[model samples]
Target: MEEQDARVPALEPFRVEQAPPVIYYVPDFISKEEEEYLLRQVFNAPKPKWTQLSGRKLQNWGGLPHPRGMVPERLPPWLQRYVDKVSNLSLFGGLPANHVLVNQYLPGEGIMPHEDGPLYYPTVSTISLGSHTVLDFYEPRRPEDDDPTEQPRPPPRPTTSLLLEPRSLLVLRGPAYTRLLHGIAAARVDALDACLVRGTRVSLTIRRVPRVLRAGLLLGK
Candidate 1:
């Protein structure tokens, strides 16, 4: 006989009530042991796998997303396990996630505010490992207001910030995914509620890239 297991609970209770619609902050989504295993796998990747940007390094799995179409690649087992778990949540319009972006950030290194664009399915699920960080969201400038004829604009500021704890899962959809801009501040310490110094963090951004081209079909070119 095998050991019995319980079904995963619905994520509704974990939804952030005060924030804009469709933001789920599930703390302790992964246990400390899993976090350690994920961190080891992330650092075990070949040196060439990482793409160094201005502030952070990232490894892109499941092919590069292109507007035309992404040539799909199989995810390794280490990542595929978590991808399947997230897929079971039924968030990706019934489609399983096929892409994962592993991003590593050091204290004081943060990305600029930006949208995920139209390349993938609208929902974005990220699992935080190693350290906690605050994700800041800003009101995106309306397209109708991007006129040179209009009066000079005010400098942009974050409308709100979400504190992401280590081993937490942040699921963003609705306006949080499509409309607003999200980024992390480049600070060595965070003071959202209580003071906490930042440390090296690894985030696994798992999502389904709806547009995928079969490799067999592309070989004719």
Candidate 2:
């Protein structure tokens, strides 16, 4: 027998093995009371902080991510605490998160499939509050190289789904971050067999902008 036993990891307990390279879905990750307090903090934010998108409204905290690197901005204390709490899990190998996007969506409102791009750390953590939604994933769109001109390319198909309940935490990394696209659907109501989604639903999208540099500064260092 070996002197040492198998290694233990905090995230391994929540990992979704049937999904892509990395996807951890933790339901009821936060208590109901905490969910209410967080929602209050979100609603109480200054109006000017919000930008209305076609289907939802959002407050972009921590500036924006760009190719040259992101100009750092501090996150609100309430929001900061969650990211810090998440960071404690070593989600990015001890790298602290520096951004949070608070999105509010009403019934029948949803976003299109898209990737987070190459601006932030390769991982993403989301805290859902107020309502439950299905965070859907799809295979990345790619055309067959076999033929020079195929009349039409096949669209990406659904891979797997996770029901994000209120106060839940969803962490995505590896293929979930780099290899696939994710988005909620447009619907007022979603059940397990449904597109499953927004409420006035709010999502605390936390990420780390690995690079930081002054405007037009070329290199971060």
Candidate 3:
């Protein structure tokens, strides 16, 4: 791993002061023009680039991440520029990021509560564009102990949530990354107030996915 970059004075001062172990939320991390440019590039990709999922659509770039090793592919210049920017933060333990999952969520679309797992590095950084969304965090489910009915249960609602505005960047690490699970709710609009849970919010979910190599055979070999 390379040496970590020096602290970013501007960003360092605004770190999420109320959150757990580690989380960095930067509002307006990208300019409006830059956000528009990114959105355009995303849609400009070929039709086949998109993989339709039940709730949201996504475009995979920088190659698929595998357990063994990633063959690696060149990221588009537009995407590469952002990766370089984030990498400078030394978020990936000194290794440059090489994978990105571009997810598009329309109103009322969201992902399930779950951990990011062990595929990529422990940390996850995101850049939100277009609009804002609330990202919620939940405590992991624990198995029953002495009494089946007396087992510890997950919090009734999200332990915390964050409001992510357009063009913002959110970085999660440490316990925030390993101990709890994160997800967005399926709603057209999010309510912002004291009652609203506080965690971190809008940013691209960026991280490195390690890939393994595979060989192709001509026939059935």
Q: Which prediction has the highest TM-score against the true structure?
A: 1
lDDT of 3: 0.75
TM-score (C-alpha, index-matched) for candidate 3: 0.83
Best by lDDT: 1
lDDT of 3 by residue, 25-111 (tens): 887889989998998888798998898999888888877665656666678988988999888987787788877788888777888
lDDT by candidate, in order shown: 0.87, 0.79, 0.75
Worst 10 residues of 1 by lDDT: 1-10
Of 1 and 2, the candidate ahead on TM-score is: 1
TM-score per candidate: 0.90, 0.85, 0.83
Please list the residue runs of candidate 1 whose C-alpha ends up more than 4 Å from where it truly belongs after superposition.
1-9, 147-154, 217-221
Worst 10 residues of 3 by lDDT: 1-10
Residues 29-61 of candidate 1 have per-residue lDDT tens digits of: 899999999999999988988999988999999
Error of 2 at 204 (Å): 0.3
